[PDB]
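Periplasmic binding protein/LacI transcriptional regulator, Clostridium beijerinckii. Tokens?
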Amino acid sequence: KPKIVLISHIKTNPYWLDIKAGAERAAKERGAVVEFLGPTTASTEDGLKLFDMATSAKVSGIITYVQEEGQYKKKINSAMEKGIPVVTIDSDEEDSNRIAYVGTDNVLAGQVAGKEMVKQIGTSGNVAIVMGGKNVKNQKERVEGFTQYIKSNSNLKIVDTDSSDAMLLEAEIITRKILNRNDNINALFCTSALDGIGAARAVKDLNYKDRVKIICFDDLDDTLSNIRNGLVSATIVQKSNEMGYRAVNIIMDKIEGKSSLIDVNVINKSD
Ligand SMILES: O[C@@H]1[C@@H](O)[C@H](O)OC[C@H]1O
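Tokens:
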């Protein structure tokens, strides 16, 4: 049995458990084993260590999350040179020899969120940002696209940006801190899966629904309920299950000698 290591951002995050589910479905169909790994707290060094161990173990393939630009290139290329195929997932290391990237165009997803934000609150007002790690590659990319969009297409001001490190409780805490130190926030932009849930708890608890609208990421059950009940105005949905499934199929196609980025969708109370 071919063994494929899948290295996640955070092993217990429901987004990554969805990715794992897709990966396991593919592995079942293709007859491979998926070893699903990752740190309990976001850590580039831990990810790289898992990558090193996978490489030393001579596994059949490696699918890896990329937490920081330029930090993965060497190990990816060294693994490719040892004949181990690498796929990146849900954040890319574009300047490497990985055979494929499975995930979103993250700057573009940010632009998409910017357009929805303008649709939801108009062209004037104050926005605060909650990101899942300040120095995390696809978070920075999402903030970059969002910022570019609203800069060119509105008069919206970003008055505060802070980090949850992609944890739910920290998202709640930081969002309360943001609402407390700012006097006229009209909306929150949340860029990782648990951020929107945490932010929603904070706005609900502080009685800011609805003075504060929320645009966030991903379609976790709590987020979809918050869209139903009016707490969240919109969420930007990625195809996480499909990313897992596709990554494993690409690795297996490579091992068996057999031979475009994933669009995002907006979900509203309509949807
Ligand atoms: O990197 C992941 C991101 O794509 C998702 O939106 O939020 C959870 C993170 O682990």
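The chain has two domains: 1-104, 105-271.
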